[PDB]
Amino acid sequence: LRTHAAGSLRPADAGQTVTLAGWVARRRDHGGVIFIDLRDASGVSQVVFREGDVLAAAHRLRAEFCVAVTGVVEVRPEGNENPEIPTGQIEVNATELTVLGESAPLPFQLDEQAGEEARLKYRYLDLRREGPGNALRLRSKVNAAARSVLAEHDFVEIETPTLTRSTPEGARDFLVPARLQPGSFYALPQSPQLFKQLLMVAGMERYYQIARCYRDEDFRADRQPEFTQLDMEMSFVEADDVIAISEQVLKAVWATIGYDLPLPLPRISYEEAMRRFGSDKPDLRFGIELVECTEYFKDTTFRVFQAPYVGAVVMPGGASQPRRTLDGWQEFAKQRGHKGLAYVLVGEDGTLGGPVAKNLSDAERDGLVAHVGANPGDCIFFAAGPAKGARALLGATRIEIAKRLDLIDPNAWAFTWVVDFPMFEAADEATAAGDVAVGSGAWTAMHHAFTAPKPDSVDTFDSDPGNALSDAYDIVCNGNEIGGGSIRIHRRDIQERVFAMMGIDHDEAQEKFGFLLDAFSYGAPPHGGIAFGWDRITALLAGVDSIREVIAFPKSGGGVDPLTDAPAPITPQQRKESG
Amino acid sequence: LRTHAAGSLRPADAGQTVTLAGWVARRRDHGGVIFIDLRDASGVSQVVFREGDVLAAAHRLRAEFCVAVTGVVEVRPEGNENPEIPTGQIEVNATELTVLGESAPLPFQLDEQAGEEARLKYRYLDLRREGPGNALRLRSKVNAAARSVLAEHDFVEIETPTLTRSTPEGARDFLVPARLQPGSFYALPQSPQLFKQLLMVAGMERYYQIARCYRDEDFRADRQPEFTQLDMEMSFVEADDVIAISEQVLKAVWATIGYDLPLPLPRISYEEAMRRFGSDKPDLRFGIELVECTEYFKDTTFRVFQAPYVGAVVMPGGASQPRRTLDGWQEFAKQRGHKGLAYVLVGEDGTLGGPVAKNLSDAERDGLVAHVGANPGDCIFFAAGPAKGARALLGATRIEIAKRLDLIDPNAWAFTWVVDFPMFEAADEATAAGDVAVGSGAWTAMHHAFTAPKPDSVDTFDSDPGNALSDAYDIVCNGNEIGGGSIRIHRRDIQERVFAMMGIDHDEAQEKFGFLLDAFSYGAPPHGGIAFGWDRITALLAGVDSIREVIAFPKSGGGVDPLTDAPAPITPQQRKESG
């Protein structure tokens, strides 16, 4: 049908018959003449209807009509040129017109952003808009960039099952009843973790898959019921090898938006990340680091600071703050499961004000500004109490400071690996009210149960779990965790010991993960890997906050599908097969 | 750990310290010396343990132990050279040994093919075998070959949802209950069909996805509950355009095994395919075509041939057949829902024998051999009755003839498109016993409901359904359907008319496919596409019959998973959430 791309027409094309196919972006009438912009994937040419049957037929045209037009390229009359677009100095004088597909009046115009429900219900229209459409095209280039790096390093692309055994690993599975086995269920996978490890036992050596993953969560934190991971695994490797290839993937991926990524990326320990930034996904686009004051307040008589941790965060020029917003700081603190946020105001003199300053000793008041590296005019925030909660509060406080003061360059890309993760977290340590709760559950995995201990934690990890370190690693971009992996356990005895920690008996381990444990009986290799949050990465590259903007047909909060009205009840006929 | 690839060692490497990591393919002892073949992905080097601690430690080694060895490359003693392998003239004199992973005695040896249950339960071991492992590596190259063609022609790779609305389209869906919506269910998709069409309405123009598809079938015909399709769609196209790009995909895919595919591929109509070969997935690696005898027997008085169709298939030299096997031909016929298979024996003279010949007229007996193009010594098989059943029988008969006579070159690749498919099949036309049954159901779709009629069937298709032709097309390889697509309907009124045919009322259409029908209100473009059976294609390229051999972790008959013992019953705790 089509002879030319709409965006390809130039002065050089004058006098030639052309045929374009696409959409009417707009129509405007002046004199007895009809003017349209004809849009296709390659861009836009103006098309005019001046005389005869074509003109009569063009009276039918409206925004988003799908059409084919035939006409003669002409240079636009003097003064009509559109300098802004590549087609700007031509137009097509239409000769023939066929309406391929009529459009009704639009639920929203394409130069408008509608509410979420409307954009999803009419996502086929939303994707005609420049931004949404380009996001999806970007995603395609992103995939290809990753694959090209992986192929260059001899990775094998392997598809893994999505109908699996329901395993008692963390998080709720989506279930699928089996017609041919009344009462039995498949589960959709959370990750291909177990499969990729089996592929290592299989001798595949270097595996990747851009894989669909499924998790039935309470769907906060910008979650989707199904999401995409770039999954990788390698045999005979240490962490450095997984990091080096990951970094090659990241460089090619960022090249897609014309950013040259400087390698290698910074690395920081979990304990250093937590100490310096109060977060294991630290945002390094600005400073405002935590300063420890525990030892500084060792001999204090101020009750609030008689705690196992005291930490500070300095707000630049924050003394000049008005009091109404200082009360909200307390609300900010409470909204997060914390009792409050103490503060010391450093007035223009260098002298300390606020409800804290008077309670400190002369010796404490004195060396304070220096210790926290504050300057006159600043507001120093303090958090005391159990270290994890106090640090998290200070980590959240520095981010809020950076928002409020614009320390945060919207063009910058700041990456880091977080390495040397503890092997375990404490199951449920703090009350919702903010206190230390009585520990019920066993130890829980920091990343996952299949994560290896570091060599000098091998003998100790089940006797001294809280201090045990792992070969796990996260990669962080602008305060977002964009990927995570680890060196795996590849011995049965070590994997059972880990399971014992988690309240999984020898018999329970064999019943639930036996297929993995037995595979380790047949010459399993050292192996390790990583998984990237592909939707997050694509969202960051497109410059949007929500991953919904980079999925073709996403769900909205609650797993509701405005496009198809899924999920929906089924018939009783379908139900009798067979659960 | 590793310094060198095991397959990379040569004479030039003599005297150098190397470190290999992989598996012990075998161990053999002679003198006080231990000899192993060390295998990794790149191949095999012999490694020897001659003196000291290494030798003592090597007494522990067995088949499939995963190890790292350090040693000095030496040229093999005169007479020891293995001319068959690239490493053949060196060996490594081991200096150090670390057992990375012990192996227990194998359930089967790697130079053996075990039974299916064993191969699946221990698929991680089965994939260490040369053939299975190479199959998976081939698959990876196959994907990449397709993607490179699609990228070259500006296709956008787009991921489509796997959690969807359960639609009343053909075939049983896998269901997924939704925790957040007690009583409601997602369905897994049969194909991305509806989504790819919406992406056309979205202006994406050229789409592809290598997609996971789900179907809960009775699991005969080498079916898997989940399978992979290469899915494609384009806007502003006719059949030729979909075929031309498909052919580019096929050429690159076949290039993976060093076959240069001659383009363009042959094309044949559905009616011609059925007439000539009694099949719409004809096997063109041999001849033995159907010859119509309907008009030839127009004036016959032999009751069996007083039928609306009579067809023949000539077996080369089949008169010299013994009688015991001629009775089995009848069983062959009955095993397929047919009453029998008539035959005429052409003896060495050219004179006709058998139970048919005597019943024909002089004039019928005479011109017979000529008409069917037989030669003395041949056996002519006949099928009479309703055309569809008789042709299918003759189509099945010619394939059996070709097996029995080896007319069938195992290296040949014979392709064809089958075009001009009828728009509809008759719902259930024949009895299991072989008779014409009373038609119950409405008309059913030949490919799917979204398939467009040809231009000169547009007004007629719902008044003269049986004669209505479509713009559907299949591509066939060596008697296998390897892909199928069509030009779509893109107007609401035409799609409702199709639904009416199928017993889907206006109200039922809007309730079940409204999201598609409404999308057609907003300037839908002409569009068309194709889906390839990716597992079948990969199986053909690997040279195996079963697609199980080209899936990393396949199910066996019944959707049973010997690897993980899925599907399995769930806990009552899990069940209370929430169906």
mmCIF file of N, CA and C in Angstrom, chain B residues 5 13 80 84 88 95 97 131 136 185 320 326 349 395 421 493 504 511 527-528 537 552:
data_model
loop_
_atom_site.group_PDB
_atom_site.id
_atom_site.type_symbol
_atom_site.label_atom_id
_atom_site.label_comp_id
_atom_site.label_asym_id
_atom_site.label_seq_id
_atom_site.Cartn_x
_atom_site.Cartn_y
_atom_site.Cartn_z
ATOM 1 N N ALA B 5 41.162 -23.101 28.776
ATOM 2 C CA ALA B 5 40.089 -23.971 28.331
ATOM 3 C C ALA B 5 40.674 -25.359 28.040
ATOM 4 N N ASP B 13 52.041 -25.418 23.776
ATOM 5 C CA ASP B 13 51.854 -25.095 25.196
ATOM 6 C C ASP B 13 52.795 -25.835 26.155
ATOM 7 N N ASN B 80 51.152 -42.873 22.313
ATOM 8 C CA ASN B 80 49.987 -42.546 23.144
ATOM 9 C C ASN B 80 49.035 -41.542 22.494
ATOM 10 N N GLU B 84 42.244 -38.618 17.158
ATOM 11 C CA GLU B 84 40.832 -38.270 17.021
ATOM 12 C C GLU B 84 40.423 -36.914 17.633
ATOM 13 N N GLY B 88 44.753 -34.316 21.416
ATOM 14 C CA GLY B 88 45.372 -35.629 21.259
ATOM 15 C C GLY B 88 46.847 -35.838 21.525
ATOM 16 N N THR B 95 50.073 -31.298 39.074
ATOM 17 C CA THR B 95 50.914 -30.798 40.148
ATOM 18 C C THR B 95 50.071 -30.582 41.407
ATOM 19 N N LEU B 97 45.670 -30.620 42.898
ATOM 20 C CA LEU B 97 44.332 -31.107 42.682
ATOM 21 C C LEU B 97 43.463 -30.616 43.798
ATOM 22 N N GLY B 131 24.813 -34.729 22.759
ATOM 23 C CA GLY B 131 23.609 -34.422 21.979
ATOM 24 C C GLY B 131 22.625 -33.488 22.656
ATOM 25 N N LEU B 136 20.482 -27.705 23.247
ATOM 26 C CA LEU B 136 20.171 -26.476 23.973
ATOM 27 C C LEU B 136 20.994 -25.285 23.504
ATOM 28 N N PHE B 185 -10.262 -15.196 38.816
ATOM 29 C CA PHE B 185 -9.178 -15.956 38.205
ATOM 30 C C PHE B 185 -8.544 -15.242 37.022
ATOM 31 N N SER B 320 3.763 -57.237 -6.134
ATOM 32 C CA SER B 320 4.615 -58.314 -5.612
ATOM 33 C C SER B 320 4.558 -58.462 -4.081
ATOM 34 N N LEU B 326 -1.179 -57.353 3.160
ATOM 35 C CA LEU B 326 -2.301 -56.719 2.471
ATOM 36 C C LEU B 326 -3.543 -56.667 3.355
ATOM 37 N N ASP B 349 1.866 -58.744 -16.298
ATOM 38 C CA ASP B 349 1.280 -58.694 -17.640
ATOM 39 C C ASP B 349 0.747 -57.305 -17.972
ATOM 40 N N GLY B 395 -3.779 -39.516 1.963
ATOM 41 C CA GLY B 395 -2.654 -38.753 2.499
ATOM 42 C C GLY B 395 -1.840 -39.552 3.502
ATOM 43 N N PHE B 421 -6.602 -20.741 2.663
ATOM 44 C CA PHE B 421 -7.359 -21.608 3.543
ATOM 45 C C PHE B 421 -8.820 -21.182 3.535
ATOM 46 N N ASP B 493 -17.706 -4.346 12.686
ATOM 47 C CA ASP B 493 -18.848 -4.976 12.016
ATOM 48 C C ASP B 493 -18.516 -6.337 11.377
ATOM 49 N N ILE B 504 -21.901 -16.741 18.576
ATOM 50 C CA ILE B 504 -21.612 -15.694 19.551
ATOM 51 C C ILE B 504 -22.425 -14.439 19.219
ATOM 52 N N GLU B 511 -19.234 -8.685 25.650
ATOM 53 C CA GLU B 511 -18.922 -9.112 27.020
ATOM 54 C C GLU B 511 -17.581 -9.824 27.112
ATOM 55 N N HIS B 527 -3.865 -5.081 9.507
ATOM 56 C CA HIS B 527 -2.749 -5.772 10.114
ATOM 57 C C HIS B 527 -2.810 -7.249 9.911
ATOM 58 N N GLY B 528 -1.648 -7.875 10.047
ATOM 59 C CA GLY B 528 -1.511 -9.295 9.833
ATOM 60 C C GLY B 528 -0.240 -9.785 10.465
ATOM 61 N N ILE B 537 10.477 -26.306 15.331
ATOM 62 C CA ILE B 537 11.580 -25.811 14.501
ATOM 63 C C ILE B 537 12.934 -26.199 15.097
ATOM 64 N N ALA B 552 14.845 -27.296 27.972
ATOM 65 C CA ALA B 552 15.793 -27.558 29.066
ATOM 66 C C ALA B 552 15.209 -28.524 30.077
#
